[PDB]
């Protein structure tokens, strides 16, 4: 389809966590989503939050309909469960790497289904729980998903990083290794 720009509402519901998601993307970047627990719209940038509004109830109503469709389709398909498609994993810095200069490590997990994941950052073999963030499960046009995990850090000659990823399509946990150079 020919277009200058693509604006997409994407949503899913599933039996496992996370059980639901409602989001809007513009040219493949997530602009906002509805937090289904808090029942409120969350904007990706303060730029959008100040200029735009969205009634979160619109998202909540569509989720409920999607859930009914799930229930209907579990039966009609004779409980058809999809194959687990394993993710490709890449690790890369946000900024050019300079020892002593704050940066962000990005772990990108791509082309996987279902949207069920375990992700852990490791520094010198030990789990990091501070300075971490993550995107939503982002949709792909092939109906698989991708996701970003983030870690703020100060590059050094001493430290070593791994992005540890678990998914049902993998035989074992996958580690992607990163070092400052």
């Amino acid at each position: 389809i020919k277009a200058d720009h693509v604006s997409t509402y994407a949503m899913f519901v599933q039996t496992h966590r996370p059980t639901g998601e409602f989001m809007f993307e513009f040219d493949e970047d997530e602009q906002f989503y509805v937090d289904l627990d808090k029942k409120e719209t969350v904007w990706h940038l303060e730029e959008f939050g100040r200029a735009f509004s969205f009634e979160a109830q619109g998202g909540l109503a569509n989720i409920a309909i999607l859930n009914n469709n799930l229930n209907t389709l579990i039966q009609r398909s004779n409980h058809t469960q999809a194959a687990n498609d394993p993710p490709e994993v890449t690790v890369f810095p946000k900024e050019p790497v300079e020892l002593g200069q704050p940066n962000t490590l990005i772990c990108h997990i791509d082309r996987f289904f279902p949207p069920v994941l375990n992700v852990t950052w490791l520094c010198n073999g030990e789990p990091v729980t501070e300075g971490v963030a993550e995107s939503l499960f982002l949709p792909r046009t092939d109906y698989s998903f991708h996701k970003f995990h983030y870690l703020t850090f100060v590059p050094s000659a001493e430290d070593v990083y791994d992005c540890r990823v678990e998914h049902w399509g993998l035989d074992q946990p996958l580690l992607k290794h990163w070092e400052a150079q």
Partner: protein, 195 residues
Amino acid sequence: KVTVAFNQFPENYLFQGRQECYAFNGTQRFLERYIYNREELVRFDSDVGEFRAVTELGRPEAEYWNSQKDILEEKRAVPDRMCRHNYELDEAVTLQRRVQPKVNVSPSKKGPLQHHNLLVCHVTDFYPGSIQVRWFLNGQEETAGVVSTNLIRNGDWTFQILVMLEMTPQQGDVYICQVEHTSLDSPVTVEWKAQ
């Protein structure tokens, strides 16, 4: 800013939906997709004007929904209602987002001037994604030996890209990485001199 209503019909089952607005020139094309796991079942396409069953499991809904004049008119009205409305807002704001590229130049390895090396132009934290990166040697553009990763999405409304040049630096060679982007009044240049 608005949305529209989706129509109603260890182990894991999933249902997915898409409401897609394709903006091209001043037109809007709208697609609504119903998906079980990774399988599209039923689709509305404003260019068709009605629902189409993509798979046999979507056939009952496609047929029933197409018999409801009210459901169709709600969907056919989407391009000029939801798509145009949200687009006008994104035109006024999202499409005005301009973030300037930072440009860093460094050799892949440091050292002698005997043999091959890679000169890396690392361009970071820009939006939108359309960008032009060029290598120059002594004032002349290099077309061969240019190795680029393609556009890299950071997922935080910024892009980066790395364009590297295969080089064999001789003392007093001047290398320039030239960057052009809509956020820039004039091109950014970073110079690296062989020494």
